[PDB]
Write a protein that binds this ligand. Structure first.
Ligand code: 10M
Lengths: 100, 26
């Protein structure tokens, strides 16, 4: 079985690689773009205003081999803020394609 | 049927899966 410790190791490397992208990817065409971010789960690129942003299921998941073409989603609003969940400050995401 | 090895495997797998859930929900 896929152990906690190996998943944590993979997660750390995912985060490492993401942080490198956050620092090294060129700035977005406009400040109207939604901003790149690591949310502890996935690495998000900058987003075009009024569009959906997609990223692959994080490869550190124990079941990543079962969801090889799955994607997780955010929505970048026309004001360059990531779409938020009501009440909260938290961003809307759809992770359903990456469930076990 | 279900064996003692199944339950111990399930428990270990669950450790990783809870970590994933801590990542997500938060
Ligand atoms: C109630 C309305 C709110 C729902 C919003 C949540 C979903 C937003 C994102 C749309 S998901 C949809 O997934 C489809 C695949 O199942 C995607 O299908 C397409 O791209 C796929 C690769 O991702 C590819 O395999 C297919 O051949 C291709 O047709 C589709 O692009 C995507 O919008």
């Amino acid at each position: 079985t896929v152990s906690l410790w190996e998943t944590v190791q993979k997660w750390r490397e995912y985060r490492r690689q993401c942080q490198r992208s956050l620092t090294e990817d060129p700035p977005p065409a406009t400040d109207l773009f939604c901003n790149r971010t690591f949310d502890e789960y996935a690495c998000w690129p900058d987003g075009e205003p009024g569009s959906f942003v997609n990223v692959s299921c994080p490869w550190y998941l124990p079941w990543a081999s079962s969801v090889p073409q799955g994607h997780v989603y955010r929505f970048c609003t026309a004001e360059g803020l990531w779409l938020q969940k009501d009440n909260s400050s938290l961003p809307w995401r759809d992770l359903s394609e990456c469930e076990e | 049927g279900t064996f003692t090895s199944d339950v111990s495997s399930y428990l270990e797998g669950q450790a990783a899966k809870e970590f994933i859930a801590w990542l997500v929900k938060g």
